[PDB]
């Protein structure tokens, strides 16, 4: 075959991986990975072009990103604007893309039966995109709106500010996102034809020698091979040289600098950065990984430990950060407590002391060896990935590794290279440092403004005395290298499947104190388990005060176990512990082999917990900030929040929590934990490589520990109170209106409540949702350009359900609302006119979506945990509900629309949350006339004036 330059050899895979692989290089220079998995419910492809923002023209910031939007909008094999995404939608698929500095990465998934159709529509993006003129004018708004969303986000502000304080002549300085000004307004003024410029960029850079493709389906390797060759050898090779950037964006003048910056949220952070050469080529020994592992360690003797003990910082991130071909960074980043902000010079001193300890001891092979072994285990035992993410990640790394080495390259670690370690470490020095501090205390004391985000800041040289006192960092006896990691798993046996192993979880214990659900894993056979526990207590959430105390206590506990648990996390054993509205959640995941040791430690600490005064004050203060900081979350996130507050029986607001928090004292917290712990019920799912007897053993010990140390006794059945959804009146329409004080965009969520969940009411709603899904995005966003964020779909809470739209926009919510209603009418007309073939396509897509099998253990646990915490316990739900779906008719869906959702439906139940932009006042399809809504004035008054739904009835 003359279409294929080369077929690759064996692709090194994990032993536990049952998928089959073949790499190849097409004659046009495209790198390919084909993945055959004959069990997959969804097939997938991705293509990654090794070009991005770093190559935008200097006078059209954002071109490559914009180009990336435009490729979705028609090709002239498939000129119909939304052909691609309508096809995926009717065949259970989904798609997305991103632009980074050097890559533009596109990907989809689709039902395994429609790979070729999906793939051929996709391949056209790369042959002849339309860039239609009127679609260009529309979609620049989506881009602009995407920038708008980020403008007031602290992380983007910082990301761009770093760019703006390095070499302005360096392409690292470029603004990558684009916006209406850079894409349309400034180019019109300059006489630039943006259409030509998209085409020119695509023609110059979308070349086959810069592309990798990955394709995953049911087909054999040979068939997938034919498929790829068919669709992609047509791609032109323009022989583009790969952009390289050997000059570091930070030169001499950009070093030994201090930046003091004003954030939007009340946060205090120190960012420390050193410029470093590109380390990518050393991937085999990865000295950057090695140094990050040490500098960023969190266990005893670590730099964090000390800083945290001094009461300076709570969290720390260390290690190498990507730049581009030719440069990288090494960062050490911390949060600051109020003392920490006064002690920045000391924090940095300590950073250098720790570094100097590494210098003094030299590189440690035993450490490198432990990283190597741990990576080897993680790779032997890796979870099977979802196809979409997997094709995308892999398409990205085919640019970096020989075909044969791509599955292994980002895991396996090979030769210890003490010498490269010293070369990197030797770049980590005071003469080489950039310091940034972020804090509201610089408000009014800054003299510079970043040009794209408007970020307020100041820049100063670090004085020579400071650099010198840092260069003299002596050693500090509080810094030691990590001890050997004792959590490393060593028992990997898959216990054989028991005589009466069940396919769904079985209830193997049911006492007053515990309900215990158990299933031995019958699909994955990895030495791993998931242990999930819900602990109910009425005192977790009885009142704002208490709800604050539940939270604080769990934080303080995590803070206290952190040194010990970090090791465990490195060894693939982790946990999650948080307060809920019912009392506490605890989850331990990872290799089964040492789970009981960590589990036991957690329950032991939790029941015998002694609070550190200094810790308590620090964490309380961070939580206070965390509560105020909600004001700077996105308008659409505000709308979802207020709706949850409105529709739930009991819910404390951030204002209520914040008010009640000054009253939380050390002595009341100390009294709170015993009370919290004294009476409990525990519901549990243990799922994994574990046996009935071991499960009982695990549960017994959780109990015996609580019982022993906390004297815990069971709860009454009637004390086990789940909460209700507000029941909306037939034909009611309510609006709650609030303002976001930070973002100059508005948000809205509209909720059409339907009825209690049940087989039929579930599938009516889900099918309608399916039918309107891409039309909603296509109309409200693509056609009308209301905003970058446009979502629609089912809302499920507290046993009830309904259909929701969320949108964020520069347009006022009253307007968004008429548009949604207009769209609903367009949707109705569209269902009346659609063919039976089309309708069954939708049933079929929904069906595939719901039956798609879990690919890893924890996705299967999440399904069961869903059924448990919601107390519906319907483990065979997908089968029942899909059989039922298959029965539904167009006429049915219409009658349901007509009784529940249409504007003059007898049972319409509508609530809208309107969140006004910072700055706003207190052709198209025909919008219908709407009633005067009842304006909600007070959430409590609203909840009280209304009935409450029942709770849903359970199954097993």
């Amino acid at each position: 075959n003359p279409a294929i330059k080369r077929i690759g050899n064996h692709i090194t895979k994990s032993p536990e991986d049952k998928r089959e692989y073949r790499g190849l290089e097409l004659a046009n220079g495209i790198k390919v990975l084909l993945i055959s998995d004959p069990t997959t419910d969804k097939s997938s492809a991705a293509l990654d072009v090794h070009i991005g923002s770093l190559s935008d023209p200097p006078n059209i910031a954002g071109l490559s990103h914009f180009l990336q939007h435009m490729l979705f909008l028609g090709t002239k094999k498939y000129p119909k604007e939304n052909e691609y995404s309508q096809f995926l939608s009717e065949h259970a698929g989904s798609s997305n893309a991103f632009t980074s500095g050097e890559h533009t990465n596109y990907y989809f998934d689709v039902s395994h039966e429609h790979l070729e159709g999906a793939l051929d529509r996709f391949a056209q993006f790369f042959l002849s995109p339309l860039f239609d003129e009127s679609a260009k004018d529309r979609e620049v708004n989506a881009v602009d709106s995407e920038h708008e969303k980020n403008v007031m986000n602290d992380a983007w502000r910082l990301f761009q500010l770093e760019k703006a304080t390095g070499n302005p002549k360096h392409p690292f300085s470029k603004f990558g996102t684009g916006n209406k000004y850079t894409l349309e307004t400034r180019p019109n003024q300059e006489g630039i034809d943006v259409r030509q410029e998209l085409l020119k960029f695509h023609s110059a850079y979308y070349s086959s020698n810069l592309m990798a493709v990955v394709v995953l389906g049911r087909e054999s390797l040979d068939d997938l091979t034919n498929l790829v060759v068919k669709l992609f050898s047509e791609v032109e090779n323009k022989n583009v040289p790969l952009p390289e950037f050997p000059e570091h964006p930070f030169q001499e003048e950009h070093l030994k600098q201090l930046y003091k910056i004003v954030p939007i949220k009340d946060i205090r952070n120190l960012y420390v950065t050193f410029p470093i050469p590109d380390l990518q080529k050393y991937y085999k020994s990865n000295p950057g990984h090695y140094l990050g592992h040490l500098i960023g360690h969190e266990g005893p003797g670590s730099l964090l430990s000390e800083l945290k003990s001094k009461g300076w910082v709570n969290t720390l991130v260390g290690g190498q950060k990507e730049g581009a071909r030719g440069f990288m960074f090494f960062i050490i980043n911390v949060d600051l407590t109020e003392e920490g902000l006064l002690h920045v010079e000391d924090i940095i001193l300590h950073m250098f002391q720790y570094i100097q300890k590494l210098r003094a001891e030299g590189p440690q092979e035993w450490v490198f060896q432990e990283l190597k072994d741990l990576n080897a285990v993680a790779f032997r035992f890796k979870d099977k990935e979802r196809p979409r993410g997997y094709t995308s990640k892999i398409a990205g790394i085919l640019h970096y590794y020989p075909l044969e080495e791509v599955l292994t390259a980002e895991y396996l670690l090979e030769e210890f290279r003490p010498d490269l370690i010293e070369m990197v470490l030797d770049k980590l020095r005071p003469e080489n440092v950039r310091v940034a501090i972020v804090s509201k205390s610089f408000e009014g004391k800054t003299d510079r403004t970043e040009e794209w985000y408007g970020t307020q800041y100041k820049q100063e040289a670090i004085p020579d005395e400071v650099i010198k006192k840092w260069q003299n960092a002596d050693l500090n006896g509080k810094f030691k290298l990590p001890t050997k990691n004792e959590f490393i798993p060593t028992n990997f046996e898959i216990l054989p499947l028991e005589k009466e192993a069940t396919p769904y979880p079985a209830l193997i214990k049911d006492t007053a104190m515990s309900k215990l659900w158990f299933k031995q894993d019958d699909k994955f056979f990895l030495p791993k388990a998931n242990l999930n526990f819900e602990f109910f207590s009425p005192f977790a959430y009885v009142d704002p005060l208490h709800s604050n105390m539940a939270y604080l206590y769990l934080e303080l506990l995590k803070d206290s176990l952190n040194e010990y648990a970090y090791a465990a996390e490195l060894a693939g054993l982790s946990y999650d512990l948080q307060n809920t509205i019912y009392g506490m959640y605890l989850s331990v995941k990872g290799y089964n082999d040492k789970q009981p040791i960590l589990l036991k430690k957690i329950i032991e600490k939790m029941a015998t917990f002694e609070i550190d005064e200094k810790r308590f004050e620090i964490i309380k203060e961070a939580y206070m900030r965390s509560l105020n900081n909600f004001r700077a979350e996105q308008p659409h996130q505000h709308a979802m929040y207020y709706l949850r507050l409105l529709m739930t029986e009991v819910a404390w607001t951030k204002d209520e929590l914040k008010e009640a928090l000054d009253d939380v004292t050390l002595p009341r917290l100390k009294a709170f934990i015993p009370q919290l712990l004294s009476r409990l019920h525990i519901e549990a799912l243990l799922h994994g490589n574990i046996t009935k007897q071991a499960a009982l053993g695990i549960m017994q010990m959780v109990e015996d520990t609580l019982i022993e140390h906390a004297h815990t006794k069971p709860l009454l059945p009637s004390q086990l109170v789940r909460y209700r959804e507000v029941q909306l009146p037939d034909r009611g329409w309510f609006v709650y209106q609030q303002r976001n004080e930070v973002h100059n965009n508005s948000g809205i969520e509209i909720y059409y409540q339907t009825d209690m969940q049940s087989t039929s009411e579930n599938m009516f709603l889900e099918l309608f949702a399916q039918i309107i899904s891409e039309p909603a995005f296509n109309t409200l966003r693509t056609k009308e350009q209301l905003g970058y964020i446009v979502f629609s779909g089912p809302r499920r809470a507290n046993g009830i359900q309904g259909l929701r739209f969320i949108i964020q926009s520069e347009k006022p919510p009253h307007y968004l609302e008429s548009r949604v209603e207009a769209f609903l009418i367009t949707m109705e007309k569209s269902i009346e006119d659609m063919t039976e073939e089309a309708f069954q396509k939708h049933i079929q897509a929904l069906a595939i979506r719901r039956l798609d099998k879990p690919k890893k253990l924890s996705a299967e646990s999440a399904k069961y945990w869903g059924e448990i915490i919601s107390q519906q316990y319907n483990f065979d739900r997908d089968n029942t509900e899909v059989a039922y779906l298959k029965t539904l008719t167009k006429e049915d869906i219409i009658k349901f629309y007509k009784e529940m959702l249409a504007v003059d439906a007898p049972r319409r139940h509508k609530v809208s949350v309107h969140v006004l932009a910072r700055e706003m006042d207190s052709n198209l399809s025909q919008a219908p006339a709407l009633p005067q809504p009842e304006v909600i004035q007070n959430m409590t008054e609203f909840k009280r004036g209304l009935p409450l739904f029942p709770l849903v009835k359970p199954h097993i």
Binding site: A97, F98, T177, G296, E298, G319
Partner: peptide
Amino acid sequence: DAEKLVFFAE
């Protein structure tokens, strides 16, 4: 511990 993409949809 050991150590920015613009998307088409969220």
